[PDB]
Amino acid sequence: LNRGDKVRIKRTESYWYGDVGTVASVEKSGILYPVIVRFDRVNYNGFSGSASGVNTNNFAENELELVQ
Amino acid sequence: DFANLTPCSENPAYLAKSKNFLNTTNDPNSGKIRAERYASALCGPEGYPHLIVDGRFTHAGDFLIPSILFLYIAGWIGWVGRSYLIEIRESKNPEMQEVVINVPLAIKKMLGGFLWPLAAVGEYTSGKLVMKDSEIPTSPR
Amino acid sequence: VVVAFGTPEKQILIEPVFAQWIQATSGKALYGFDVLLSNPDSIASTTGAAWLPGWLDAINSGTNSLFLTIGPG
Amino acid sequence: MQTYGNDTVQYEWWAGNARFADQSGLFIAAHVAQAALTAFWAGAFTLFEISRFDPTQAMGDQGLILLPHLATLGWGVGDGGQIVDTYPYFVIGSIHLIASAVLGAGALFHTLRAPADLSTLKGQGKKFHFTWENPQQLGIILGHHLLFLGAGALLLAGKAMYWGGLYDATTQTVRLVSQPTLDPLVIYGYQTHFASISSLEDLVGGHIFVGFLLIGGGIWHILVPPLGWAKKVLLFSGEAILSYSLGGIALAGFVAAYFCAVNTLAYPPEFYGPPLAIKLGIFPYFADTVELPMHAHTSRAWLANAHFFLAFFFLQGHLWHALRALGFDFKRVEQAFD
Amino acid sequence: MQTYGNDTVQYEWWAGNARFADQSGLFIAAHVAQAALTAFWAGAFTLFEISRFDPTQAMGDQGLILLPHLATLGWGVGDGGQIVDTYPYFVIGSIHLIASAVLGAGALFHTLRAPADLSTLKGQGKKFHFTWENPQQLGIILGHHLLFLGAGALLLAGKAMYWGGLYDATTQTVRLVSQPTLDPLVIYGYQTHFASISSLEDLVGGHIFVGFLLIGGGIWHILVPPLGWAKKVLLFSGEAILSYSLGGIALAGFVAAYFCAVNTLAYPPEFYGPPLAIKLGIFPYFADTVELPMHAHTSRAWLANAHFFLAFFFLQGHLWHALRALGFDFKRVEQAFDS
Amino acid sequence: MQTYGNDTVQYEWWAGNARFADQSGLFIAAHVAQAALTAFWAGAFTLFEISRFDPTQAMGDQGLILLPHLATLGWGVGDGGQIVDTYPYFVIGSIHLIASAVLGAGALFHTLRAPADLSTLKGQGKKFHFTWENPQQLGIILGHHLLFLGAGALLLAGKAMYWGGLYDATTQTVRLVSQPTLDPLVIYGYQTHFASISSLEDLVGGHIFVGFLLIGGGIWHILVPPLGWAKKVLLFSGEAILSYSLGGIALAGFVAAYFCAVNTLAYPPEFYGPPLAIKLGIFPYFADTVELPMHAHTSRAWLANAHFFLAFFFLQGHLWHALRALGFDFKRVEQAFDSL
């Protein structure tokens, strides 16, 4: 989409399936998953005992619904 | 009817044991006051008060008055913790407000929780109490 | 804790009224409920069922384990 | 019958008795079959009560409801208030069982041989055709039904004054009521103490007044159509004409339950039981004065408490059908709660 | 209603009774149904108390509140202060219960058949349309209600000086009153000892002068509109007129709670019970001076303690609506406690 | 209030009562509702104590503090400390509680129908608009309140001399004060043994010469504006006038706690209870001579101990508002600990 412009993830395999994420950037370079979506909730990531996970993941345009 | 129970004023096992009630507190007549208060209940074969919770208003003080008193306070604790958590998530750093309590915001929410049932009914009607199930993070089935 | 502290009358003891009521609706008149089969004047009692003199004798004898008397424990 | 802004509305099978409200031939077929079922209950349960009648004990404590109605009429009560012959009760239930087959014949005639709508018929079938918008046709029907109800009330007074008389409770035997009651202020003064009607002469002259008024309204409704003020204030819908009759028979069911519980003349204690105190609890009911040995109830209380619940639920059925006639769909109540 | 500068106010379902306050046709339907429910309670619970009535022991210890009222009017009362007939209670209970069905039908008439606004109607429905800012029409409504309240007070004097006859709590009998008081000077002096009057002549003659006052005040509000000083002093909104009625009936409820607890004339001890002691604590409550066991309460303590608690919370409802009429949002309370 | 030169200071909800300072209309509504709440407590707890009073015991043993106030005032005692009337206490406890409803109504009047500032309206009410910079207007308010307090002190003079009397603990009677002592030499001599008084003529005569003093000062403050020396020495700010009153009411709370403990004329032992010994542990408390059982305290020991702790924290509240009126920012205490 565009920077800002919060979307809801429709990718079923993701941690954030049904969560609202903000689009960080779109890499229009022929990428399979060009949309960087930034979240306010970190996922299950990292070795055991880690205090936080990652909040960024790449998505395709078909996996996102505009909600903003 | 509770024919297997007897009132404690006419229960003979209670009467032989209410004269030896131990003083729980510093008042030397604590067990005698407990002997008078527990005499109105329904006692079993060995003189202990068997509470009735079926919904009878004769035994409303057994469960219903504890029910109304609990659900008011537990609804108060739940509402002011919910209303604090909604208020702090709109800030710049919502994470630090849970480990470091915004105490004047907490006192302001907690004193306003005496009208939680009229507030929970209002937020249910406004739709802000319950989120839509398609707007929630969901497991991949 | 209240039994340990010498005050067993301070125990929260709830009579299981809902399951004592079902014992009454099968015929046990020990609890004083007059409902269905414990009440001899109901339509369930007066239907002329041939189980009923044998069932009411067994449910009220107390020498069996048919419908045991239940309490707060 | 209602048509909430649309035509050809198909009713489901659980509300399947609403499709034939515009069908005049099927309207005759359902109602006469109801009268066939009603006359069957008057005949088969009279024989059922005869087969379960014991003259050793009281009639009202046994639980018979049709036989004390015939015993009040002056049939089989000729010696001491005790039943000695069941032949008058057998001859009445036999005619009712015969007339149930007669009414059941014409009911199945109208749903299988006669057409479902009588507008296609010719001759007298065009005159018998009715619809739920014609005022003058419904006044013909109402005046003709008022004539037989007036003749029904006059035949009771004809029975009570010429053909034996009724069971008078103040003398424990049948008596002739050949002297009538003519002064209308006695009847007009019975709007206060109608329950305590301890006078058989005042009851018979009342039915003369009812029987002559209902043939007066029978002649009036046949020869004169409904007027313009009656059409303005009363809705002439198929559900609405039902709604007036539902509340009208609920008022009759409440008064008949009040006559059943507390009267001593038309409901004698020798055949029904002692008069009943008007108790009230969650719902009003007429509790028994004395206990029963098998936790049963007397036949007077079985009549009065059932007719109270039948009149209340017919009042609620009047309320369902009046709000449907006026245009309330009951989905407006949930329409505001949002 | 109070707009708060909003022409199209919405109201949720918990405040859904505020939607028809500008609708005069639906204003009738919610008040006739209230009168249907009020006359049903006078009908059904008179007959409910007939089923729970015992000739042994008085009505005070039996927890009855309606059969004490009709017995003080002098219906079914023996010469020794006992109760001999439950049928005059049955007739009065039947009349109220059947008139509830007439009122229950007529409220369903105005709900469905009559329009929501009576300004649409032509004929006599056009005259019965009221707007809340029409003081001339409001006095016509108020003046006609003062006639029926005046005729209700004259009906009590017409029941005791005539056919009927009130009960006397001194000689314990039903006595028709003869030659009551008619002095305006002695009725100005009853403002002090109003709750300890103990005289049927003063009660009936009091009802004559307050019956003639409401009839005389009824014909003044009908013929004469509000003068202009009342429009300047009082407020004529939808909730403002309700505020005056809520405070007016809270003041009537506080006197009626006090009159039940201490007076013996209109509340005889052989029907209601002994006069209550005015106790106080976390709330003012009139406690039993004879202490019926097993939390029974002598049912004079049921009128006097409910009609104080009803009049207290109707005074708080008066304060709720007078604040809304004066222009308090009540959302400003939450705006005082914002960050 | 004090803004520290920040002009538009926004107070939070816990200091929300500082918002209606420098607003004349809401200043009336907060104080009339205080008088509504004060007269409600006078009315309701008189009837609360009537519903708790029994004449088998003493009045001081039951924790009753409002009924002995009315009994000392010269109302329905039976005979020599016996209390069998119970009706003039109900009349006083009902007059005060109906008056709280009138004061409760007038507080909601000035909240809503009257504006928040009285300078907006016109008429007689625009002369009631006061600011926290005007000595002429603030002295007009002070003069009229002195006239009310002076007439209240003269109301005790009229009650004792004419309308009934006062309960004399010396003679165990309620008597008219026929000849009060109008000598200013003996009243000026009562600076030392003010709380050791035992004569009703000295009490009533001392009330006359303060009732005339407050009325004479009330006429003085209305007619004469505050002088130039008082403007130089006293801060005429919003929080300064409060701090003068907080210090003034704390001094009265200490004197009234001392009058309650040791005096037997205005606090007779038949009603209030036996006189107190002024002990001191970590704070000055007042303890009884004889120990009332069941861990209960005498109602005199309840009045004097509470009115010292109220006067101590009202002195601490005076110190809070004096330093704020002086110019102490009170975040400097945090900034002193920040640097240290």
Ligand code: CLA
């Ligand atoms: C169960 C009994 C029963 C039933 C339902 C039938 C059925 C039928 N008969 Mg009838 N019929 C019967 C007994 C019965 N009949 C007997 C005993 C007689 C001699 C007295 C006749 C003489 C007879 C004649 C003369 C004619 C018929 C004809 C008819 C048909 C039209 C109805 C009519 O006008 O006559 C109905 C006549 C009755 C006497 C009705 C008796 C029905 C009672 C009420 C019994 C209760 C019904 C029972 C529960 C069965 C339900 C079936 C149904 C509702 C589904 C109908 C299908 C007509 C035709 O042309 O058919 C070829 C016609 O003209 N029948």
Ligand code: CLA
């Ligand atoms: C105030 C916040 C709050 C609220 C309103 C909810 C709401 C919910 N909880 Mg709970 N819960 C919370 C705190 C909260 N919880 C926390 C702190 C934890 C960790 C202990 C949990 C752990 C949890 C479990 C494990 C379960 C629930 C479940 C549920 C549901 C049943 C209600 C209940 O009593 O559960 C019981 C809740 C508890 C036993 C924990 C309550 C912890 C304290 C007492 C709550 C208040 C603490 C907080 C610090 C207050 C903040 C005040 C503020 C001014 C600073 C309900 C949707 C159940 C569910 O999903 O059912 C549908 C379930 O299985 N919750």
Ligand code: CLA
């Ligand atoms: C003289 C009686 C009368 C008449 C002729 C009508 C006519 C009509 N009603 Mg009904 N109505 C009335 C009275 C009447 N009603 C009463 C008394 C009630 C209150 C309960 C109602 C409430 C009502 C509703 C709620 C509805 C109607 C509707 C209907 C229509 C179709 C009904 C149908 O298919 O039955 C089908 C019948 C059944 C499925 C059988 C149900 C049997 C129940 C369980 C009761 C069983 C008896 C019970 C145990 C008591 C026994 C009594 C004992 C003495 C034997 C039809 C136009 C419908 C309508 O107009 O909508 C289009 C509709 O929805 N009626």
Ligand code: CLA
């Ligand atoms: C003569 C009585 C009178 C009138 C006609 C009005 C009319 C109305 N008020 Mg109300 N009000 C009054 C008395 C009155 N009130 C009193 C007594 C209170 C104090 C408690 C208030 C306090 C008040 C508030 C707080 C509100 C209004 C508002 C409303 C409006 C809609 C309310 C609604 O939809 O109810 C719907 C009814 C319910 C949801 C039922 C609630 C039932 C409660 C919880 C229990 C009460 C009964 C309880 C079981 C005790 C029974 C005792 C008995 C057995 C002896 C409407 C203008 C609203 C407004 O501002 O208008 C927009 C609003 O918010 N009123």
Ligand code: CLA
């Ligand atoms: C005549 C009394 C008087 C007046 C009119 C004022 C007026 C004011 N003061 Mg206060 N002050 C006084 C007495 C007075 N004070 C006393 C006695 C104290 C000593 C404790 C102080 C100390 C004080 C401080 C420390 C503060 C003020 C401030 C304020 C302002 C806002 C107060 C507010 O909104 O709090 C609303 C009230 C609360 C939020 C309640 C607080 C909770 C406490 C603990 C309640 C006490 C409970 C206690 C147990 C009561 C029972 C006593 C006994 C029966 C057991 C306002 C101008 C504030 C200021 O400087 O202005 C900006 C401020 O911060 N004052």
Ligand SMILES: CC1=C(/C=C/C(C)=C/C=C/C(C)=C\C=C\C=C(C)\C=C\C=C(C)\C=C\C2=C(C)CCCC2(C)C)C(C)(C)CCC1
């Ligand atoms: C009566 C009774 C009883 C019974 C009970 C019951 C049976 C109940 C039911 C109940 C139920 C079955 C319920 C359900 C529910 C559901 C749901 C759906 C819910 C919801 C909830 C919510 C929503 C919540 C919220 C909240 C609040 C309100 C506050 C706090 C916070 C929170 C958020 C938590 C008994 C026997 C015990 C006893 C006697 C009496």
